[PDB]
DNA sequence: TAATT
DNA sequence: TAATT
DNA sequence: TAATTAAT
DNA sequence: TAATTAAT
């Protein structure tokens, strides 16, 4: 289906631009490079206050 | 520790975006996300997929070849 | 770039 | 330590 | 003593 | 398109 494959290419194309918004947001919200954010992120997941402050978040993230 | 605070809300709101992405998947192609990801790996590695966009497929192969 | 200096 | 690397 | 993607 | 021990 080409009339539906054309839709599929756009759908993932936009959701790519959103992670870019996250990258821009992280840079302008924390004055940090976008990946050092993720370096300490998985470390703080394995801390009891992280699983107490927001359970579903750390649950999904630790699941990786 | 207030940086830790707003980071939690940040990933929380972008977790909701992932949730919005899941619902967008379920109501645009009538497809569960699991089979959606079961075919995504079978389509990105195609000659036509690489041809349409040079950066998209390259990022997809590079990042998963580094995470795994 | 990214903890490490 | 503290911008600078 | 339950849960959950994921496997087969 | 569901099932099921079994894994983590």
The structural domain count of chain B equals: 2
Residue A44 contacts residue B4 (beta carbons within 8 Å): yes
Alpha carbons within 13 angstroms on the beta-carbon side of residue B13 total: 11
Closest CA to A61 of B1, B10, B55, B20: B10
DSSP, res A63: T
B4, B15: one domain: yes
Assigned token pair, A27:
């840079």
Assigned token pair, B12:
């929380």
Which nucleotide's C1' atom has the smallest distance to the CA of A36? C2
Residue B22 contacts residue B5 (beta carbons within 8 Å): no
Question: What span, in angstroms and rounded, lies between the C-alpha atoms of B17 and A39?
Answer: 21
User: What was the elucidation method?
Assistant: X-ray
What's the gap in Å between the CA of B29 and the closest CA on chain A?
9
Residues 1-60 of A with CB under 7 A from strand C: 33-36, 39-40
Measure CB to CB from residue A11 to each of B6, B28, B53 and give the nearest one.
B28
B24, B48: one domain: no
Which nucleotide's C1' atom has the smallest distance to the CA of A33? C1
Question: What span, in angstroms and rounded, lies between the C-alpha atoms of B59 and B67?
Answer: 12
In this structure, is the dihedral angle defined by the CA atoms of residues B44, A42, B34 and B19, taken in order, positive or negative? negative
Question: What span, in angstroms and rounded, lies between the C-alpha atoms of A21 and A27?
Answer: 10
A1, A27: one domain: yes
B63, B42: one domain: yes
Assigned token pair, B11:
């990933």
B19, B41: one domain: no
Question: What span, in angstroms and rounded, lies between the C-alpha atoms of A50 and B28?
Answer: 34
Q: Which residues, including other chains, have CB under 8 Å from residue A42's CB and lie 6 or more apart? A: A61, A62, A64
Residue B38 lies in domain: 32-68
Alpha carbons within 13 angstroms on the beta-carbon side of residue A48 total: 0
Residue B22 contacts residue B33 (beta carbons within 8 Å): yes
Residue B38 contacts residue B49 (beta carbons within 8 Å): no
B44, B66: one domain: yes
CA distances in angstroms from A8 to B36, B53, B68, listed in the order given: 11, 13, 26
């Amino acid at each position: 289906l080409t009339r539906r494959e054309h839709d599929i290419l756009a759908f993932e194309r936009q959701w790519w631009k959103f992670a870019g918004v996250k990258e821009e947001a992280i840079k302008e919200l924390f004055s940090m490079s976008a990946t050092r954010y993720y370096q300490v992120l998985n470390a703080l997941v394995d801390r009891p206050e992280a699983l107490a402050a927001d359970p579903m978040l750390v649950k999904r993230l630790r699941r990786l």
